[model samples]
Target: MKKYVCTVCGYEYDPAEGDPDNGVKPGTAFEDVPADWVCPICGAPKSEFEPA
Candidate 1:
């Protein structure tokens, strides 16, 4: 599970500590993450995330 970063809010999406609040299970790979999972902080689109 690679680290992903939100450009909008600079939120670091760590699969190891997944965002369960958003339905993201732990250890979820970025490739397997849902398309609707945007930045929880800024609501940025998935397109705004880049491999960190």
Candidate 2:
């Protein structure tokens, strides 16, 4: 699975280890995450995420 990084905060969202704190389960792909999901560490919108 590809990884995504928050362009605003440098938070890495990994499909192998989803953001549990944000209700994202492990193994979930970046495309599977909710559109409204924000970076848990910096509150950046999903639009701010890019391939890592």
Candidate 3:
């Protein structure tokens, strides 16, 4: 799975934790993140998602 680390605070978005605001349930795959989902910690768009 591709883990996304926040650019500003280095917070890791782990799929095991899920993205509640984006409707991503826990255990969801990393590639399954919606195109419009933003990081809860930094509010960064998908474009900021890098290899972590």
Candidate 4:
């Protein structure tokens, strides 16, 4: 249940497979993401994301 999506572009985030493309390691939770981290796909801020 640790999945989230960007409201702006529907970029899905998964905890099991972190956004290594952006340097996020596996097992990192949505709340643990860096404050400046944006959606890798659409560049939307974290505030524009939510649980899926």
Candidate 5:
């Protein structure tokens, strides 16, 4: 699975392959992203995420 990090915050979101909660899961819309989701270090937007 791809690990994502917040470019602006250095926050990381890592998921193992086949994990049901992975963000790339089908039907996971950009806007539907969870409200509690944010850069843990800086509170940036999802747009700041990049492959870690």
Candidate 6:
């Protein structure tokens, strides 16, 4: 799976370690993160994430 990084906060979104804080479990793809999901570290929108 591809990983994404939050440019605003350097938060790395990895499918192997999904955003557990946001209820996203491991194996969740970056493309499947909920529309309202934000960078748990900086609160940036999904749009702020780029391929890592």
Query: Residue 33, candidate 2: how far off, in angstroms?
Result: 0.3
How many pairs of residues collide in model 3? 0
Candidate 3, residue 46: the lDDT equals 71
TM-score of each: 0.86, 0.87, 0.71, 0.88, 0.52, 0.88
What C-alpha lDDT values do all the predictions have? 0.87, 0.92, 0.76, 0.89, 0.60, 0.92
- After the best TM-score superposition of candidate 5, give how far the Cα of residue 17 lies from its true spot, in angstroms: 11
Instruction: Please give, for residues 1-52, the per-residue lDDT of candidate 5 as tens digits.
Output: 4567778867666554212443545444434556556665687877778877
Q: Mind giving the per-residue lDDT tens digits that candidate 1 earns over 1-52?
A: 6899998788988989887887889998888788888888898988899999
Q: Locate the minimum summed-lDDT window of 10 residues in model 5.
A: 16-25
Candidate 2: misplaced stretches above 4 Å? none
Per-prediction count of colliding residue pairs?
A: 0, 0, 0, 0, 0, 0
Candidate 6 lowest-lDDT run of ten = 17-26
**Residues 1-52, model 6: lDDT tens digits:** 9999999989898999887888898999999989999988898999999999
lDDT of 4 by residue, 1-52 (tens): 3899999998899999887877888999989888899988888899999899
Q: What's the lDDT of the predicted structure labeled candidate 4?
A: 0.89
Q: Please say which candidate is ahead in lDDT: 1 or 6.
A: 6
Residue 19 lDDT (model 5): 21
Residue ranges of candidate 4 with Cα displaced over 4 Å: none
Q: Under the 3 Å rule for N, CA and C atoms, how many clashes does model 1 have?
A: 0
**How far out, in Å, is residue 4 in model 2?**
0.4
